[PDB]
Amino acid sequence: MDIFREIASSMKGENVFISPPSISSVLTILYYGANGSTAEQLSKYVEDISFKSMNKVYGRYSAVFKDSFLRKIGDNFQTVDFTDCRTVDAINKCVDIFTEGKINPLLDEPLSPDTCLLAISAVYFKAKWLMPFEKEFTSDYPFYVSPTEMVDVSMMSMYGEAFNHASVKESFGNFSIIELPYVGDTSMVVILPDNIDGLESIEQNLTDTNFKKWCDSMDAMFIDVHIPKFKVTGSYNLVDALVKLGLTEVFGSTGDYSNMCNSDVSVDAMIHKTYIDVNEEYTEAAAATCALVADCA
Amino acid sequence: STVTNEFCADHPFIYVIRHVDGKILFVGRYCSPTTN
Numbered sequence: 225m226d227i228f229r230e231i232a233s234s235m236k237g238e239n240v241f242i243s244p245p246s247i248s249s250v251l252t253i254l255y256y257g258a259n260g261s262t263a264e265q266l267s268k269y270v271e272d273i274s275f276k277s278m279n280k281v282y283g284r285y286s287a288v289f290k291d292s293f294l295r296k297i298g299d300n301f302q303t304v305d306f307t308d309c310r311t312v313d314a315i316n317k318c319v320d321i322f323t324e325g326k327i328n329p330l331l332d333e334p335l336s337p338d339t340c341l342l343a344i345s346a347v348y349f350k351a352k353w354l355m356p357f358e359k360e361f362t363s364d365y366p367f368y369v370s371p372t373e374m375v376d377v378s379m380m381s382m383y384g385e386a387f388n389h390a391s392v393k394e395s396f397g398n399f400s401i402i403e404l405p406y407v408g409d410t411s412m413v414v415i416l417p418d419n420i421d422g423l424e425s426i427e428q429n430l431t432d433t434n435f436k437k438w439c440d441s442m443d444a445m446f447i448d449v450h451i452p453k454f455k456v457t458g459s460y461n462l463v464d465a466l467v468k469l470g471l472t473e474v475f476g477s478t479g480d481y482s483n484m485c486n487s488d489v490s491v492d493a494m495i496h497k498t499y500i501d502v503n504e505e506y507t508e509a510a511a512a513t514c515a516l517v518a519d520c521a
Numbered sequence: 522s523t524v525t526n527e528f529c530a531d532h533p534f535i536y537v538i539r540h541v542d543g544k545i546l547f548v549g550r551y552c553s554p555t556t557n
Contacts, residue, residue, distance in 0.1 A: 239550060239552045272540065275540070349546060366531065368533075391523035417532070448526065451530045456551075456555055
């Protein structure tokens, strides 16, 4: 996970949770309206009952758009007045009900009249574990924030069931990998370093290619599982991370989006907000991504 | 070596929510608990 690594590396010590498809779907909107270099840089990111996603594109009513851009976006387009602030409330309310109240509010600042376009993505997930953890076994255990810093966490336990699992030996660290299934066709794969402090070097090699190799090697084995019950919400500005990743002709002035608008527009911000709740009964998650395109008058 | 009888996540770990085929829906890192 390209983007995950960047964000993780730049927030050492911090919990991190992101939804790659949500980010990828906004970048794709931007792609649809970009030309040249900007388009080339972005192309590298153009890509059930448990997972739902939706994209909305809001355009400034006084702007004139390119039909191609609009053709590529489909019935996800809508014209609005960014001037009126009820506009921000209508957008948030929409992201809010689609994410079952988990992402609210996505937009924190009254948008600028300098704004031309908002491409928003929202995704929602909720599913019960194929096999629930029994609350009876949930109890407080020390969690190692660092080798000698212990903090109390509510730990869930499931004894003597079997799960797909693999002991992985790698030049960058050894770890255990397990798959916890959800009712339906999704699962949660967890990567646990053998070294109390070895996550970073493994994190640094978390690649789509590597990740699949590890999954491919898993076999059913009996193993007892203890994992924290947890809730986390994150808010990330993705620009820096994305620039560091090679999207240098995408944000600000140098952004070329003449395949979107007539005027000269620029993308001056890109936020990602997320939420996840892991409990003994189910896992619930949501995320929303927004890129704000401005510069037109 | 690595464990294979017990999966004790009492230290930082990575978790990935994915579709069985293979599409990754969410990726996170658990460094420490939050609030209480």
